[PDB]
């Protein structure tokens, strides 16, 4: 019983130095890359073997043509924004679109854009409206909100199409996306400075990457130091939490994929 997601990203770069695509688009299911396209290859290709084995050549050929179309649209969209801001030189434009399928069967969908890695326009598929961050974003917001048919297209795509694609992709990649590898969880005692003891709860070998780790007394602890959930580079993740003891004064709690662990 866990959440899955499908996401398509788009990166456009104006005046890229010779070694940088003007345009990249990558799809993800959860943390896995499923699809790639850029302005150098001009080809949509699978980044997961379970996508490769399950979608016939016509899929890649069709979406190749679609991605050439969207690459051109992106380039014109960026140029226009740069006109609006009166920006010269290299700038970035980004878009993320996707949906979540939760356990209860409920869904979410989103679409947002970024100029130089900052929030520009965020879509509301319920009020069918665009949140603009500045005056320039408001100007694009008015053009987009005047095309009622496009807002409705977008609502439908996020709520029906995106979820249909996700379910199809989840079935293709079920052995990867729906498996569990439980964490190997150790507790280290380190003297960090003389007299002063700190406890490190470390976890590795786990998938999915989502995991909860905390320290409790006999009541949660204050000043817990958290390590990022990091990829081990074999399809599994590592992560840790530390506490520092008080002079003359504890257990590590981990929760992963519906399994709860205590180390005292």
């Amino acid at each position: 019983m866990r959440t899955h997601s499908l996401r398509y990203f788009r990166l456009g770069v104006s005046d890229p130095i010779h070694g940088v695509p003007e345009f990249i688009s990558v799809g993800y299911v959860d943390s896995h890359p499923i699809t790639t396209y850029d302005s150098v290859t001009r080809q949509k290709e699978p980044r997961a073997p379970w996508m490769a084995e399950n979608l016939a050549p016509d899929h890649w050929e069709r979406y190749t043509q679609l991605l050439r179309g969207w690459q051109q649209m992106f380039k014109v969209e960026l140029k226009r924004l740069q006109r609006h801001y009166n920006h010269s030189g290299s700038h970035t434009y980004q878009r993320m679109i996707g949906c979540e399928l939760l356990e209860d069967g409920s869904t979410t969908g989103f679409l947002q854009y970024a100029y130089d890695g900052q929030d520009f326009l965020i879509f509301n598929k319920d009020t069918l409206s665009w949140l603009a961050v500045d005056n320039v974003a408001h100007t694009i917001k008015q053009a987009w909100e005047a095309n009622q048919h496009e807002l409705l297209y977008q609502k439908n795509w996020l709520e029906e199409e995106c979820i249909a694609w996700l379910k199809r992709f989840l079935e293709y990649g079920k052995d990867t996306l729906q498996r569990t590898e439980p964490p190997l969880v150790r507790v280290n005692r380190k003297e960090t400075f003389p007299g002063v003891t700190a406890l490190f709860c470390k976890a590795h070998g786990f998938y999915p990457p989502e995991i909860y780790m905390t320290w409790m007394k006999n009541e949660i602890v204050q000043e817990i130091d958290y390590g990022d959930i990091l990829p081990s580079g074999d399809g599994t993740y590592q992560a840790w939490a530390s506490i520092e003891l008080d002079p003359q004064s504890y257990s590590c709690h981990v929760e992963h994929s519906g399994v709860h662990m205590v180390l005292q």
């Epitope: 001009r42 899929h59 069709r62 979406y63 043509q65 679609l66 050439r68 179309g69 690459q71 051109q72 649209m73 048919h149 496009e150 409705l152 297209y153 609502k155 439908n156 795509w157 029906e160 199409e161 249909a164 694609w165």
Partner: antibody, heavy 109, light 113 residues
Framework: GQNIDQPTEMTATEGAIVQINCTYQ??????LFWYQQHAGEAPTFLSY??LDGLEEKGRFSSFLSRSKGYSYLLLKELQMKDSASYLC??????????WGAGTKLIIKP | NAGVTQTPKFQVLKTGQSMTLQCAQD?????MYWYRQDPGMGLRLIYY???????DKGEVPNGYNVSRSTTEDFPLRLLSAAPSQTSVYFC???????????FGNGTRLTVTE
């Protein structure tokens, strides 16, 4: 991206009402369109539905039932100038535009 | 704007001749399409182009080729006129893959042996 059906021909009287039905079967859907094509002329965009319900522009309405896989184009207060082919088309999951064989509308004065 | 300009309106060919149908739009549209309309069936896609620099086969591409070296123009070439190619041809454009098509005024084409 499977199938789309609309009647070959309908006949109605000037001043009356006509409902042109279009049924479609698909797994995946990005909207259904009606175009108007006069004898010897280009098809011209009339309507776009993607959500359930009814859209109204003067004498023309377009309905869509997603669970029925069904749309109609409703013409009220028919004029001789409404004598034309009405083309049903929808977009599948890959934006393939799937075209009906079209409905020839004959108006009787 | 003019919309979609398609020429010629009419053409007779002998079996084996080649022919180019011209089509231009001044609407900065990314998508251009070639369709044939034959009695008793839906518009059939011959070729389309998602943008300048790319083209792809429709449902009935055999006997035809296209090019899209500009946003504006999408010429259709009949390689070797056959009677089966007697039809009405329509050039169309759309801003995007899901936006409404704007149609040219069509080319009525008859091939005779």
């Amino acid at each position: 991206g499977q199938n789309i059906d609309q009647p070959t021909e309908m006949t109605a009287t000037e001043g009356a009402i006509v409902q042109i039905n279009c049924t479609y079967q698909t797994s995946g859907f990005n909207g259904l369109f009606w175009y108007q094509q006069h004898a010897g002329e280009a098809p011209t965009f009339l309507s776009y539905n993607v959500l359930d319900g009814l859209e109204e522009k003067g004498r023309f309405s377009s309905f869509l039932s997603r669970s029925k896989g069904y749309s109609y184009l409703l013409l009220k207060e028919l004029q001789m100038k409404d004598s034309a082919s009405y083309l049903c088309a929808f977009l599948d999951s890959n934006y393939q535009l799937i075209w009906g064989a079209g409905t020839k509308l004959i108006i009787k004065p | 704007n003019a919309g979609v300009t398609q020429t010629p309106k009419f053409q007779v060919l002998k079996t084996g001749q080649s022919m180019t149908l011209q089509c231009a739009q001044d609407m900065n549209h990314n998508y251009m399409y070639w369709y044939r309309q034959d009695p008793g069936m839906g518009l059939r896609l011959i070729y389309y182009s998602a943008s300048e620099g790319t083209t792809d086969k429709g449902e009935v591409p055999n006997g035809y080729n296209v090019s899209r070296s500009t946003t504006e123009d999408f010429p259709l070439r009949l390689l070797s006129a056959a009677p089966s190619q007697t039809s009405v041809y329509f050039c169309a454009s759309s801003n995007r893959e899901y936006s409404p098509l704007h149609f040219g005024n069509g080319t009525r084409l008859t091939v005779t042996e």
